[PDB]
Design a protein around this nucleic acid. Sequence first.
RNA 1: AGUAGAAACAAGGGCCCUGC
Lengths: 553, 712, 545, 51, 50
Amino acid sequence: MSLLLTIAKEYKRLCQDAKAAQMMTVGTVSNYTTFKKWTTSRKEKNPSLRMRWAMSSKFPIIANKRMLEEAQIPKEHNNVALWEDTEDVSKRDHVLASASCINYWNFCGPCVNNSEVIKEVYKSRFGRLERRKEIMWKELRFTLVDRQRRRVDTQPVEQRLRTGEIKDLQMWTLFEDEAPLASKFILDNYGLVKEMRSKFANKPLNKEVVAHMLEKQFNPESRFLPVFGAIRPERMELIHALGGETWIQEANTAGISNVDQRKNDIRAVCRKVCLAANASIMNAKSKLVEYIKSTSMRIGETERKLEELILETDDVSPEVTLCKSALGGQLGKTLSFGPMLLKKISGSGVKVKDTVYIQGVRAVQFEYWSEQEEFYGEYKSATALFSRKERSLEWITIGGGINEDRKRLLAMCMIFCRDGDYFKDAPATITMADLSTKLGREIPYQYVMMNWIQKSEDNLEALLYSRGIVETNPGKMGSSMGIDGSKRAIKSLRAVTIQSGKIDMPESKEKIHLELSDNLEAFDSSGRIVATILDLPSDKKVTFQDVSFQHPD
Amino acid sequence: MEINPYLMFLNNDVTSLISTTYPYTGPPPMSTKYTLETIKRTYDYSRTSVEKTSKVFNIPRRKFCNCLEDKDELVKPTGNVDISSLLGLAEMMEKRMGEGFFKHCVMEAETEILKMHFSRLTEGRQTYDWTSERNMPAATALQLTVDAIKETEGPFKGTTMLEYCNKMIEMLDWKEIKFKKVIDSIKHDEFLIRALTINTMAKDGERGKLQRRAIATPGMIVRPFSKIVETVAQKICEKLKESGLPVGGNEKKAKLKTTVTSLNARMNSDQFAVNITGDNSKWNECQQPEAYLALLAYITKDSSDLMKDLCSVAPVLFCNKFVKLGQGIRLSNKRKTKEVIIKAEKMGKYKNLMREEYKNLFEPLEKYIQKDVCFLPGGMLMGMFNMLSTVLGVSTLCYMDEELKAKGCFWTGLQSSDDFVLFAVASNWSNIHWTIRRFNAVCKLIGINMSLEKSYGSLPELFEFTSMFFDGEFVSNLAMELPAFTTAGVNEGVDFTAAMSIIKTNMINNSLSPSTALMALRICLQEFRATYRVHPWDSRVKGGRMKIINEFIKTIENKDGLLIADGGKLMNNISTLHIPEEVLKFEKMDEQYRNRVFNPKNPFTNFDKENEAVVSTHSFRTRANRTLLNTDMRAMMAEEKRYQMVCDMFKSVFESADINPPIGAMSIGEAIEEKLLERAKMKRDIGAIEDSEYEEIKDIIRDAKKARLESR
Amino acid sequence: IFSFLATAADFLRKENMFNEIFLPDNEETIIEMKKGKTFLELRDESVPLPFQTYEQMKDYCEKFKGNPRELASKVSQMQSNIKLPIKHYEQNKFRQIRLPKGPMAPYTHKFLMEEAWMFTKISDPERSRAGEILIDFFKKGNLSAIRPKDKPLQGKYPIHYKNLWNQIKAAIADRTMVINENDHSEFLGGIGRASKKIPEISLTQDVITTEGLKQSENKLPEPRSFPRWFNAEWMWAIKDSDLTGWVPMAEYPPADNELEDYAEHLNKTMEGVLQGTNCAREMGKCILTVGALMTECRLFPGKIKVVPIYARSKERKSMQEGLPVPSEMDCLFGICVKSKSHLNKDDGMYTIITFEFSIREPNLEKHQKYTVFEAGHTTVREVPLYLYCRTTALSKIKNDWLSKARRCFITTMDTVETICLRESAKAEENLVEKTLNEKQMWIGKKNGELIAQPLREALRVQLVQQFYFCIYNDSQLEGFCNEQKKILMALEGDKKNKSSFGFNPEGLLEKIEECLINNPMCLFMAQRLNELVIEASKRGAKFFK
Amino acid sequence: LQGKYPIHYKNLWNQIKAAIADRTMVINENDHSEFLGGIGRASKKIPEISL
Amino acid sequence: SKTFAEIAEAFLEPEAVRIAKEAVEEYGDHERKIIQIGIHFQVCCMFCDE
RNA sequence: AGUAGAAACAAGGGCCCUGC
């Protein structure tokens, strides 16, 4: 209306100038961003000092003038000043005012029709509040705590997205006339956009604020923190009030925010399609990609495509890895050898060939790495820091909490390093039938020994015996490990050390582009395998809810 | 009785109480003599006298790299470097990490330098303008340099970093440069010297090491190349494990802990370790840019031919720098009634009326001096290259030799800039001593010294690293971060939530105990009430705000819902530190009050943008200073006002200019015109507009277009 | 095709890669740094010594191959002409620290602590500002009974102080806390004693020879000796004061879990212990008086004002017997005066002047700067009265930091709670009350024996230490506290049989003793550190006597 | 519309539908039912002899 | 980010990326040209359209 | 006078303005 005409007159006056015309004529529109920096640049060293020294003045705040006249905010209400006609030096369209004026507004100022929209603008923080109210505290106890440091997520978030997928979402919900061409994320996630749009439409709002809040609503805040107990976004958001180094505020927080259930559902589906595609013999690659893109799943209220969730998750499991690999999704540098988890700290090497005799004389090639390397390793509730040297387990330290877990972690490390004589002369129990090729697909001797261990506990006992056993020297009595997994004994295994206190998971904000073979085994610019299909569970039956495998097979 | 607090250190550990020593509860304490002494020490440490003469400036050039002489008292610092040894150390580091390492890193860096926009030079600490010859913020300095480019030859069409760098290179070969002023021009030689200049700033915000009492501020013709070098240096440093400069907090603690476990597991039964806490000295006065030039040449050897040329600039520019003497000496009579003031360019004139100390310190540096600047051809300054120095330093901790292994000796450790920790291992004290001496020797061959007073050692688990004392446990001093528990200084809306967040992170990382956190919460609340001159309603305080507070308080029915800035009480505690109060009270405010507060049309609210807070009427902005009102800085305010007019109009038409950065092929005038016509139609079709109004708007716009295109 | 290209163009423009660099034509496919003429001239000039052109250096670096043997040879050679000393402390022990020599370091804090006397009244909520309390105390007549005489016990410029006191009373009587600029106030406030400028363009040799204009000779401070009045202050600031609530504090929020109950309980006990001491009343005095001066400096610059030195407290709580609901109190220790605090820029200085009331005669060594007068009599019976007077200064920074003097509580609470939780965790039980009532802490020596007392009573020593750090902080104290950690780390290594060593310990002691000059806190703590190592030498090595 | 522990009831309803779909009426996870049944009373117990 | 290949993978099919990558390796040109080629290649492909 | 530290303050701009 009249405002539109005013804007037109303003543009004309501005074009009448000479420099303004040149700057509005040259280059593209992107220059706006640049111009936004050359203006209004001024900082301060110690804002605390200047706040106590600025609020001590008479009129320390600025404020609009027309908004005050329109609101009929007087001056000198009850012998206390509220503002005075002047012009701040920077704005030139604002007038000095005092802090009391703010209170005046809050008590006898103009009221908007409704403000419950606030609960939607700030959904994340009202969500914190709601989850908190449903916690049932318990006694407080004192003791030392084993806090391991690691990277975790502190924000429970549904439908975690990327950044490019938000900068557009912030447009179709708030500034739709100025929206760009429709991107794939929009056309696919239509219901989501409709949902965010229904709430912030035909409402009195400041939109810059709403847009920033949407960025916050879709961000899993990832932090490197000391941590204890279960790992769930609901706990990590209030970890400060659950325990420190010397105390624990017991409380049950198990039934809230339902995050990990979605993740376990996703991994179950991924395992399903990976096994299915494995059923093939010549197209497991294309079969797998087809099964992936031909599937969908429900998340809360919305319907999402599988391939879209897989490229958003961060589950470092041997199943999610394969899928993210087929779809060309980059990923982190985390290894996986069966159930354990691994991560390299330093060292190097390169493949080398060797052979072993299964029964009598039957040469079988198996590879190893010719150099020294250092690794962090993680099994259920047990951690380890070990080193391999040219087909040998040089040393290892453990910081777990159970005897069973300690024994299994040590055993899988020995296998991972080809340490022992078994890799030199396999046991009689194994045969060429157990060797490999369920239906033709070979099996490296590593996973052979792996399943041989998982078969019977006595195989595990024998493998540990493959490690040297000696008499516990004096003093080292506490840092020694028997065959049962006892923190001390008279005779313990060789070159092994125990300790109370988990090991700090290493960290690296790196990404790598890997690939895979026709046997579904991923490689990383080297002969190392980061994932495979032999390291995941054999099989199980499950009833998936809210899933769509709209594909014949 | 006689009192002695230190007696508590007998029956107790020392780390679990070491924070008590830090006097951080009081104000910390706040020229040319200092700069002259620095220039002198730099020229001395170069233990040589060879010199050449620069055909460009015609000034003697002390060359300090590979020219060691005067090999006496090496215990004292030395700033000469043997490039051969430097490259040997770099090669060993590469060998450890594997081949194709440096190449990969320069590739990752080049992937960013190219797409970067040249406006990211606005972000950063102050810089030294080369037109007014004073310290402006980075934004204003960049604006003025661009304006000079445009007024000299033609507007700067560039839009990326490489184009800005090429323009700078060209400007080193022009013959007459123009720029605005209360429109002076200058020649080539004067501008060249005025570009290589470097200034100093006495900020040194952090207490930390009291030795830091200044910091460097290069110009704007040197900023982009420094950014390039630092980007590659960061990409290198992040990969190494023996470095702790980029990482922060829990990361470096975890690094140290894994290192200690690895050490204790490796060493055999006939070996024992030792630790050392080191603090190199004169760090920024021994680092030479010539060695950096040689090392960056060795790194960028297999990469593209573009990075080979970019990385080599910042070294040569720092190899030819001029320094700025500040404020000169002051003359006076006996009674001190009168007082004359003198500047740097004149001290060469009244060199007879100065103390014998200044004469002994100044006349030697009289040939290197030019008008109020000195030609320091080497050395370094504070803050210039931190990550690159850490790389150069970490290259040593990786050393290994045949002699060290013939005796079964090896060292490791962890270094951040000029602060390290060493872990030596051997089988006997005669060999621990020998290993330590070997490390010190390899460090001296490349200018890395060691402070013999500030450095100490001991048996394994007792050391310190960047104010973090380590033993079986980790003592979070918790006094290192005490000053932060104060009102940030933004506005009322923000400060309380910001303070609560700081307390929360401390409880998580630095192990602040519960009751202490409650105490800090109450203290911060009292300080907040004191700063903003407000107090509860139930209290009896009188004053400006409390007057209207008590006046209208009767209209309320539930004070539990008021905000602190309105005479409200505290409803927050340990278990609710992660929740802003506006959220914790929303369900109890009065609809009247609630609606008057969270109203978007407020003459006060401003957005700041991390900013985990709620926005409301209390989110105000302070007045702007007015000292400039008297200063004749107004001509510069003019151009700023012009840019502001353009931007605020563009935003008036397009509301998402700030949220979503604009893009497209139109200019600004084209986009504005087109959008206005479109909106005019959109309304006139259905909305409240008449054909007369539509035609008037269209006529106005076509005339505006004609004027815009006609001016030039 | 057109649709695909549109999407691609948007993506690229968003990534700033829609440029000739990434999307060149056939020709513009060679991007390169525009090596000019001057820059090349420099690069071939900045080369290390053996080379003379960047091309040679580049070829030497691009082809460099590793020769470990020559490297080892140079390393060993450098290892021989160095001779780094290594000194195990047990063999090379630490001498004692040498404090400077001269007169004693006098009182330095702006306000009096031990000799301060106060007039008290009951506080009414209506009259609560400072400029008002200063008048209420004036009506009852005691403030007007004071009348010093022209003969001071010690000091200088007694006439100026006397006239200024008379003007102060007059100004209070007129209900306008302002003072006029006369010769007296002008002399005590240093109004016009700022140097006068003389440009050099108007300068000549004759001018210099007329009035000598040599370069100003900075006169660094001169040394002092160990203060013998500091221990008295430390023991006086440890006892209760007959009142409480000296330092204002906020309220306790609600609580929902046992953790917060624990937090509230411990916080209440400790605050109740500390709020009753004398160190607390000194903190409250500083808080309120500096708050008042800061406001005045902001509103009324260029005007000499009158500000009181006061505090607010609450009389202790007896049993329910007698008069319940103990009352509040406004206390007045003296008068203060500012002088044109035109703090145009931080770190500036605005002189102030302090007239305080006391009942204890002075000492030449301690009260050196003051100018004492015999005022008259006051009750308790009758007892004499004195009036300590001086001049000093402050700045924005000292104002801001003194007003925020409640940090001492945070640090002290931190230390105590840490000890208690550490002892409680090792046993997995609440040993907090036990650890506060039983665990004993050494405090000092008396009659050559050590003294100890429960943690609950040892808190006061730590609190006073933190308050003094807040008061006497300077660069000297900064450097000292920075250099003593090396000694404590040596001590701990000694306690745990870790065979410490160092490279040059004498240099460390020299660095420490360099920063000991005329600062009571530094000198006091240095003497106490010497005594610590002495007392421990009876139980550990690495320290010489 | 009016309630006390909406999150627990909602998650428990989801678990009920899941159980019914699987043809087994049992509910494995014991977090919501446990809470909502224990809200009345649940605590530790100290032997009288250790007092 | 962190490499032109990763950038190009944002709006191209990973297959065309691998093709243009092998091509630039064949000619040994600056790998900032992974982008143009992938774009060009994909146009040609979608021009065939089966 | 006094302050402070290894240099600065003890108003500064045009009778009026102000306090990063």
